[PDB]
RNA sequence: UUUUUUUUUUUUUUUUUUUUUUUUUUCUCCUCUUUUUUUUUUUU
């Protein structure tokens, strides 16, 4: 769902940032919805202030 | 629920020269009448 796919995004991005496999590549099969994925999350902040 | 790839505005430059206005034709050709020729001279 529109609000449930975000749940999937914040589920996979939760049980993987704790462990060492934080670098992740998502092979989206559409040039259009690829930007839609990043647009509707808006909060990961996976960067240190030094980086 | 629609991915991936398909180049672009020709290369060249560090060659010598010791002439001179013009330019080139036109043929022989019946002159009508008072004359010898007047004359010094002086006032500029």
Curated annotation (Swiss-Prot):
The compartments listed are: Nucleus; Cytoplasm
Q: Which disease is it linked to?
A: Trichohepatoenteric syndrome 2: A syndrome characterized by intrauterine growth retardation, severe diarrhea in infancy requiring total parenteral nutrition, facial dysmorphism, immunodeficiency, and hair abnormalities, mostly trichorrhexis nodosa. Hepatic involvement contributes to the poor prognosis of affected patients.
What family name appears in the similarity comment? Belongs to the helicase family. SKI2 subfamily.
Per its database record, what is this protein's job?
Helicase component of the SKI complex, a multiprotein complex that assists the RNA-degrading exosome during the mRNA decay and quality-control pathways. The SKI complex catalyzes mRNA extraction from 80S ribosomal complexes in the 3'-5' direction and channels mRNA to the cytosolic exosome for degradation. SKI-mediated extraction of mRNA from stalled ribosomes allow binding of the Pelota-HBS1L complex and subsequent ribosome disassembly by ABCE1 for ribosome recycling. In the nucleus, the SKI complex associates with transcriptionally active genes in a manner dependent on PAF1 complex (PAF1C).
Q: How does it assemble?
A: Component of the SKI complex which consists of SKIC2, SKIC3 and SKIC8. Interacts with HBS1L isoform 2.
Name recorded for this polypeptide = Superkiller complex protein 2
Q: What is the organism field in this record? A: Homo sapiens (Human)
